[PDB]
Ligand binder design. Structure first.
Ligand code: HEM
Ligand code: HEM
Ligand code: HEM
Ligand code: HEM
Ligand SMILES: [Fe+3]
Ligand SMILES: [Fe+3]
Ligand SMILES: [Fe+3]
Ligand SMILES: [Fe+3]
Ligand SMILES: [Fe+3]
Ligand SMILES: [Fe+3]
Ligand SMILES: [Fe+3]
Ligand SMILES: [Fe+3]
Ligand SMILES: [Fe+3]
Ligand SMILES: [Fe+3]
Ligand SMILES: [Fe+3]
Ligand SMILES: [Fe+3]
Ligand SMILES: [Fe+3]
Ligand SMILES: [Fe+3]
Lengths: 158, 158, 158, 158, 158, 158, 158
């Protein structure tokens, strides 16, 4: 079904966001794993998979809309060589993505692409979940100090 | 069954106590949850529910006694913006409630409202449980430091 | 995540609505129970619990949004000393709440707080359920007369 | 298999009858449901589905007979704004349908379309079931009064 | 609960759309079945049932909104005497329905009938599913030719 | 129980029809099987068995009616050396049988042998099933071509 | 454990190969899915996941070797707007990857990085599997024609 060009563009933009998150989240995860921070690996890993699913949703939607998914262009990744830096990177990435989503959502509404709008709101709902988690962890680092915090990541959370 | 006016008054007073505890305990719980202190959330939550049950007991008793439950008037809540402050608030709230209970109990005895008396003693038994827990937790914060204590609240206690 | 001030205000307003419903619905329930109207007790009770859940959703959202939940200020409760009066009170309360919701929803949309918007729409969906139920019951009182209607409430609906 | 034109015509006529019943029965059902008359909703609903099945039988038979099912032309629906009026409408609708069936059956016999005849007799058997139920219900309203009758429709019949 | 007149009108319009789809989808299904195209029968049948459910949702909503469902007026059906023609008819019907939905949705938003809006978006979500399916099938007819395509419909898809 | 002579005669005539169908259907089946057309073998086989059952019904009825079943006289079989020819043979055979049935049925009615009549109508119901299937298959051969059609007969239809 | 720089470089190169395959394979998959070619979707999807796993193996190895995984730089993707073109693209991609692997393997051997060598040989073993499948499929398109081939991709292979 032919979709709005501007909409399809937003979709690809959003898809681009996910593609970046996938890679960042995944690398961070294995870095945590490499460092022996199992708890953190599990989390990041999971979040990474969620972005993979969000991306799949985007790709399928664009395709349905008879558009062309853009997986070629990859945005800048901001790794970080320490736990807090990494969490702060993700956070920043998430905040930006949310920013784009809200813009895209408002647009879909005006062009009456309600099915795309709803999809994005669902994804936004998820993103805000990643946001909360990341902020809460960052706050804990500060509250209990890094050494205790890291001690808390060595074992998998049952 | 027509009950003693003075008794029904004590009941409503006690009910008022519970109504305040419900809200305080519940807010504190979600605040802990928001902060990532699962263990603390679970506890506060549970205690909050206990208050809700106590209140139900009160409401039903007053109604049986052909009185009028008072849910309109809500006492002052003392939140607190930090773990210890919050626990200290609850503690203070609990101590006061107990104080009222003892007064109410002694009164019910004199007016021969033994069934109300026994109910209140049961509830008192519970409250003192809340008291012990609270004191114990406050003592622990002091004993191991806040950073270790907080670190201990992150995971739910299986 | 820092949220829109105006939004957080609406949230607390809505939370205030629920807090009132919780108390009204709960008292009415036990009043019905006291009167031997099991069917009615079960219903009101259930509805009361739903408002408790709606309130929890509000509290957590405000907290996430780095705002301050308001459980201190309690609106006016309108009890009623008879079945129909009570149902009419609830109805009125529900209608007002819905009115506020629609206002809040429209606002969240404009400020692009889509996740809050969606939450509220879900809650609205529920509220309208309470509305339908209450109207339908009120219509039946009139249609079969009070004596038959009350006869219909003595036993729990399987 | 090429069928008798006149027969196929009767079939479509009968199909038309069913199409009307489907809509009437279904609307009445939801109206009852809307009014809180569960027992009545269940019944009407069920009857509505039966009509849908009858229609399917008709459609398939006409098609087999290499004819053209007529779903375009919809007869007059007679709703009714009250329980008895609605039941009386259905009754009237059913009586007419039966009238047509008998005519169609007698005709199929003469043209030797025995397989169509038998099908219709089966359907007739069903319709007369709808008839009995309807009459019985109308008689009951009269016998116990509308208020008692309505009171009896609130709960689903286990 | 009294609803917006204009909204109720859109609802009935949408209901009218479904009523047409029900009949078209159902007839096409049995036509496919008559032709020995099981796979196609199953699909159309299923889709037909979905429109029946969508219609039920509409009817109940209008009723709740204290409006009058319109099942009397039936739109034009466009059958088609061949597989592709039939699929193209459905497609066209679906596209139009979606067109109406988007209009209705945008309107409900402005009048603040958020619960109706959300319902419609859900239904729209479904409709677009029918759309995708129908386009994909039409594309396959062209890609593998009719004779192979029909060969592919004789057996039920497990 | 002594039955009408003329009726018993029709019965034997009908029995004769079945005896021919049994042999034709069975031979065709194994021919299909021999050719590797499993799907077709299964079908023909099944149909062949149905004829066998029909015959049993006839034999038992005639015997009950104190008549003499005629299994000695076997009508002309029309095999055919190709799929379509075979299906066309069966079709012709079925059409004739139906023709006889209708005649027999009408007769049983006049002589008041209602139990025989009903039996025959049941059997007729079955035969028309064989008819539909046969026509449908012949239509498909034409529609998709013989090569695609044959390709579709190789595997058993699960 | 500090690893050979040149080795780590090969690893990242190989990782880069996988990153490209992930995206290409995944997009192709959903494109097939969008087109209704389930069988093809399942395959591509699976292959896409394999690439994801291979990449994970690479990332973890580089990290262990105290190197820096490179997920930022994404090679050129060659989509293709038709089934054969897509399969040919993948094939080409796979052939190149294998080419790099063999080079990397031979190198690891000389530098005595046997554990990396073995890992790569395992991955190579997998890739050659992807290769065979691809060639086989391309050969089949040619052998049976595209129309028959496509017809064979519609249903998932149980
Ligand atoms: C601060 C406002 C309140 C909040 C946020 C709240 C919240 C809750 C929640 C979330 C539940 C669990 C619901 C479920 O999962 O099914 C619950 C249960 C309950 N609440 Fe409340 N509540 C509040 C006030 C009250 C009041 C005033 C009463 C009246 C005494 C009350 C009585 C109850 C009862 C009887 C239960 C059921 C516990 C059980 O299952 O045994 N609540 N509440
Ligand atoms: C007034 C319009 C109609 C409405 C509102 C309606 C509604 C429904 C609903 C809600 C169901 C149950 C679906 C489920 O839960 O899976 C159903 C089933 C069904 N309907 Fe309809 N329908 C309508 C018209 C028709 C027509 C015209 C036909 C064609 C004869 C038809 C044929 C069927 C059939 C065959 C079933 C399946 C029953 C079974 O499971 O055996 N309906 N309908
Ligand atoms: C042309 C000669 C016939 C052949 C080659 C034939 C073949 C068969 C075969 C292979 C079976 C399945 C046996 C099994 O696997 O259990 C069967 C079943 C049967 N046959 Fe025949 N048959 C013939 C004639 C007849 C006749 C003349 C009758 C009498 C009416 C008859 C009545 C039956 C019955 C009642 C069954 C059991 C059906 C069931 O499974 O419920 N057959 N036949
Ligand atoms: C083109 C971008 C990508 C897409 C669209 C994508 C998509 C997916 C999807 C949909 C799943 C299944 C999720 C589930 O159902 O739970 C998955 C699994 C997975 N992905 Fe990705 N992915 C992409 C890139 C990557 C990358 C770069 C990596 C890093 C090497 C990766 C690693 C994984 C892993 C390890 C799994 C789990 C497989 C298992 O369960 O064993 N993915 N992917
Ligand atoms: Fe995401
Ligand atoms: Fe995210
Ligand atoms: Fe208490
Ligand atoms: Fe307490
Ligand atoms: Fe609520
Ligand atoms: Fe409510
Ligand atoms: Fe009927
Ligand atoms: Fe009927
Ligand atoms: Fe629909
Ligand atoms: Fe549709
Ligand atoms: Fe037979
Ligand atoms: Fe036969
Ligand atoms: Fe690989
Ligand atoms: Fe590969």
């Amino acid at each position: 079904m032919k979709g709005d060009t501007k909409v399809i563009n937003y979709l690809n933009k959003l898809l681009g966001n996910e593609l970046v998150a996938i890679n960042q989240y995944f690398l961070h995860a294995r870095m945590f794993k490499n460092w022996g921070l199992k708890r953190l690996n599990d989390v990041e890993y999971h979040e990474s998979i969620d972005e993979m699913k969000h991306a799949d949703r985007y790709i399928e939607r664009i395709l349905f809309l008879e558009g062309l998914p853009n997986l070629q262009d990859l945005g800048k990744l901001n790794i970080g060589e320490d736990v807090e830096e990494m969490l702060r990177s993700d956070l920043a990435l998430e905040l930006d993505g949310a920013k784009n989503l809200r813009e895209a959502i408002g647009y879909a509404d005006s062009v009456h692409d309600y099915v795309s709008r709803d999809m994005m709101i669902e994804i936004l709902r998820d993103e805000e979940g990643h946001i909360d988690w990341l902020e809460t962890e960052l706050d804990l680092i500060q509250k209990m100090g890094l050494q205790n915090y890291l001690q808390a990541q060595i074992r998998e959370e049952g």
